[PDB]
Write a protein that binds this ligand. Structure first.
Ligand SMILES: [Zn+2]
Ligand SMILES: [Zn+2]
Lengths: 153, 310, 153, 310, 310, 310
């Protein structure tokens, strides 16, 4: 959108703006999804006065749009996050994270005897909701864990 | 082509009621009229990364009665291959350039699955992977249950033993819960009760189930008595021996049994089923072991052969 | 040291501006020295152009100052980053990265047999500028390595 | 009869340029039109006195695709036979009265040769003997090099790794130096440089060779990149890890590579070739492993069969 | 003569409250004023039929601190005795003719009870007998609680981890059960819950106790947090990983804790106590291992001197 | 307080020339006038995580000679500690609460440096830490040179055998490198040449050195012949056998040798020093092993007594 305390601040030309990320979850997302790995002008605002929502994180990836699928990968980490598509210095699109069905190579199988650990494979867990508690199922060992357990690693 | 042509057999959840019946239909038909050269010219890999004679010997006999050749190994003692450091992925990748199909047993869950990802066209068949899946054992329990009861729906199936770690009782319940009106009885030690994830699974289906503390309770009700070896290690020697008594089977306990109730057990048994039972019409473990050949043969035939002439 | 006067980027009042970070390093720095694990308002800019080097990274940390020591640890990654200390809306003093005599917590010993690998010990290397390159001698196994090697990849 | 009929395959020096080409000619032709019963009724011994799954599995598959039977063993754990005290000589002498041919792997150099002296008519094929010969691995590298480059003369062949102990790079150089105009590049650690006896051998032939400190140097020049596993044990963990960096291969290092350059590696690889290379057109180890079957099949076919119908 | 003179320390059950006190009372004096020549000229057999280095090095440092000589051995398999023929009774009958006291750890329950029957007049101290007892570990625990809390009565003890198999918690709950007003908090995963026989005894004696789901609920009342190690082998890897995070202590958790609160663990710790906990003043696991030296000297001193004038 | 009081003897690098002298100076007095009750009432942990019988029996005889008690263990695999879970840090944190000093040998470099961080106030003496250091062996060497030559300055030292891996020569070259005017002769097969980092340091300090092809060239100037064992396993059997005869000493070779010349070897010797050499008065390898007893007593004495009045 438009940041201004009193002092002149940037807003990418065309690109995406992942705004409303909760404090401390921002950088993880940058790490996890390896978002920083391009030649694009990324501007990050950490620990910003979200006031109503206290403190938030914020990313702006200029000249880079995210497929709705990529937007869904944020759910477990930042569900209240709003993903804005910007064109011509204006919000042309406003998406919101949604529970995916599968979350690839970002989580680690808590099952220590899971073949997934040594070998060259990407993690892959099938998501499944229950009274709003997310159980996650490893593609390999086929075991089901609670997201609390998996996310801890 | 048949529905399983070239498909990987890894988990029992991957097969539907109609796939089980196809496999069963074939097994029954290969038992009847043998096709000793159906797989002639094929070469199959017996990769027992985790040793297992019962299962290796069974599979291999299945290969030899269909005309197939066999190469392979057992016990990954050192296997400067896989063990020293070759990643399984790389091992399959190389083996898939020699053989036409791969049967494998591994100590880690998901092994057979991962293999699938590095074999290109070569179908891999899971002969056991950690405490996860052992699909062939089940295809064989079902064949036995069908052969003896004449059906896979409407059975009073009792499962005894280590129902909490028993890799086999978990798989048998899932498959049996693909059919209709099966009622389950869960006689097991308190420290070893059926996992909840299986119980919940059943309730959703609306399947009848109940836990029993002793076998005599459900004796005169059961069609199938499925016993499983209670691993002493899982328990304390005092605890074990305390428990034991309420879960071994003698012939006398069977006087109450129906006329068609068969006692099944994946094997090995030792303490859990007394040899006196060996001599009663109800004994079916050994016969059950022999059905493994037909169950496994039907599996290779379908996977390897485009269309099945039965 | 980047000045845009149209699509403007705001400047903080007090804190530290880690300017002239070669591209792709601003994130190592972030992870490595755990610069995000703070409540202070940080602001990051990646791949911002500044012809004097092409593309650069730039990190502003509000109400936080780095010691002479803390600044030196960047010597190995962004030898030329310019750490502009700030107070009252203006640079109250600049500072450049000096190669330290010792580097803790962030490197890994290349020695496979070095005990530092399985233990609750923070690594520590002695630095020694010897003709052409930097030598780093492990505290525990005492094996000396070319820095090029200590940076596995 | 063909030139190899009943001859023993022991060393690569024992075969001439014309023998290699014959083997290659056949391999190429058996790959094309399979003769699954050519060796029907023959019984072959798989004596892996030193275990080796990659090689045993390969040989045996080669036997099974030609109709031959196989008996044999692996790992001389105790073998109250050979190990306890039976002298190899006596072991062959007995085995040569059962089978028609013997494939064997032994930990000591000259084993396969000695065997030759106690087998009467039974042809023995060396599948590895100490740090001396492993001829079959080479027949297979050459097939791969010919299949991919289309020729065995005028290649820019680079050999990387443990060039001082690498039993394979020594054999590949010798064979390749039977053909014309091959230039060699020797990128290897200083502590592990190509033996001098091989270097001198080349100079006499007047063959072009040069050592390189890094692969990037000869990248855009090489047709074949032959990498070998650098045994950590050969070195000190600090020394090793010091060295390492200048000798592992990543995909990015390959951007400079020609269009037809194939990366080969006897296997296992692990640290030396990153899995990213796995996905580039240049990757050829795995394909290379599959060519082992054709290379070995052609070898048995020729040895065992009087005249070869191709 | 003191009460403990020439007596066998086999089970905690066998020791009275007075007894307990006599030992910890002596322990403190030896810790205050050491006697390095009290047990001079004495020889003690350190018999570890089942290797336990940590317990051995302790008992032995204890024995040297009083000027005693030590001879002994570790692991019968590495030993020469009792591997195929000789009994323990013969082994004890013989050793009781050499030494002045016998310390012994043995893989099977009742092993020390049986020794006291062939030791003659030599007193036998139990350093562990299967899943049965471990007197010394408990006296060392009790001495650490008394020393830090100033009392063994009216305490707030939370016990955590594997309460089913942990022989150590069972035994401390019995000893504390001998003192007045104590209250216990048992926090353990259901598969590893405290046995009924302990609860039954706790209820029969009027002692308060209560299961809890997480330390957090109890952190603020508790005086002593006795932690134990849930061995992942006592479970299924998947199962273990789910309950793991519920019984692992971070220094943060310690926040709303009484000043006087101490964290104990028989050790080895692995995951259960996070390393940041070591810096907080509640960590006392290492000072506990340290007090083992004194509890052990007191006993050796009491058992071998008709009178002590400490 | 002497300089070495309460200090950790980890690396030779850490010791000064003064330090060196203080130790060898004390060593000679203990060898002149023994103190069998100096370290009485002390307990020292002899912790051989990596079994080294020869070094252990030595350190231990040293410990008994001063009246100290010893407890300890050999080989962690045979031990109970650090096999799957517990760290060294926990193992040290615990042991530092029993003993008065820790001696330890460990398979990995830096293992003792790390102990000094959890030992608290207990001083740690390094008896070997991987390819890293071995303080004591060097002080024992230096004491033998000083004792026989009368000085550590202006010496003619030839070092022979495996100069690349021999941790012992590296360390002695550093210690001697601290004294003035020494000159070294490095005779070693090229595959086992002295590392560059030593030469670099030798050159930076102004110290003369020079490679030589055979002892013969140097036999007449040299005062001390430090020999080492080229392990045939650090090479290829064939390779080893070719260079063997160039670094093996026969009593004949000793012919044109200075009266004062002594032959040293850390032992075990196997082929390198021929048995006829034992009768010539240059053999001093056994009297060296003997002096290890004194260099070790001095250190234990220095480290545990604020003042010595020898
Ligand atoms: Zn998994
Ligand atoms: Zn290190």
């Amino acid at each position: 959108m438009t940041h201004d305390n009193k002092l002149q601040v940037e807003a990418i030309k065309r690109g995406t703006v992942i705004d409303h990320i909760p404090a401390q979850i921002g950088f993880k997302l940058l790490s996890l999804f390896k978002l920083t790995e391009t030649d694009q002008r990324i501007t990050i605002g950490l620990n910003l006065p979200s006031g109503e929502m206290g403190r938030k994180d914020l990313i702006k990836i200029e000249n880079t749009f995210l497929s709705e699928d990529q937007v869904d990968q944020l759910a477990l980490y930042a569900p209240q996050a709003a993903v804005n598509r910007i064109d011509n210095y204006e919000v042309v699109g406003k998406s919101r994270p949604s529970l995916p069905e599968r979350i690839d190579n970002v989580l680690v199988c808590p099952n220590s005897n899971c073949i997934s650990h040594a070998e060259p494979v990407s993690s892959s867990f099938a998501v499944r909701k229950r009274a709003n508690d997310i159980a996650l199922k490893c593609k390999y060992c086929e075991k089901e864990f609670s997201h609390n357990v998996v996310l801890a690693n | 082509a048949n529905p399983l042509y070239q498909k990987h057999i890894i988990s029992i959840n991957d097969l539907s009621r109609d796939d089980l019946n196809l496999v069963l239909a074939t097994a029954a038909k290969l038992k009847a009229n043998p096709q000793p050269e159906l797989l002639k010219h094929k070469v199959i890999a017996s990769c027992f990364f985790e040793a297992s004679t019962r299962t290796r010997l069974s599979f291999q006999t299945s290969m030899h009665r269909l005309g197939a050749s066999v190469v392979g190994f057992s016990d990954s003692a050192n296997t400067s291959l896989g063990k020293k450091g070759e990643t399984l992925a790389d091992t399959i990748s190389v083996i898939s350039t020699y053989v036409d199909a791969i049967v494998m047993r591994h100590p880690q869950e998901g092994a057979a699955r991962l293999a699938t990802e590095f074999s290109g066209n070569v179908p891999v068949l899971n002969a056991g992977d950690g405490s996860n899946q052992h699909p062939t054992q089940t295809l064989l329990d079902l064949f036995t249950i069908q052969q003896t009861e004449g059906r896979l729906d409407n059975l009073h199936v009792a499962m005894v033993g280590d129902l909490k770690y028993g890799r086999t009782v978990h798989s048998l319940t899932q498959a049996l819960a693909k059919f209709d009106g099966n009622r389950f009885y869960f006689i097991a030690p308190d420290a070893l009760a059926m996992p909840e994830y299986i119980l919940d699974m059943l309730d959703e289906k609306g399947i009848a189930w109940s836990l029993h503390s002793s076998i005599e309770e459900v004796m005169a009700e059961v069609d199938i008595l499925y016993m499983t070896r209670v691993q002493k290690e899982r328990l304390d020697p005092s605890e074990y021996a305390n428990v034991k008594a309420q879960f071994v089977l003698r012939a006398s306990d069977l006087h109450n049994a129906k006329a068609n109730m068969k006692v099944l057990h994946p094997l090995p048994r030792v303490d859990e089923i007394a040899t006196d039972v060996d001599k009663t019409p109800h004994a079916w473990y050994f016969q059950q072991a022999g059905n493994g050949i037909f169950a496994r043969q039907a599996l290779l035939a379908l996977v390897l052969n485009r269309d099945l002439v039965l």
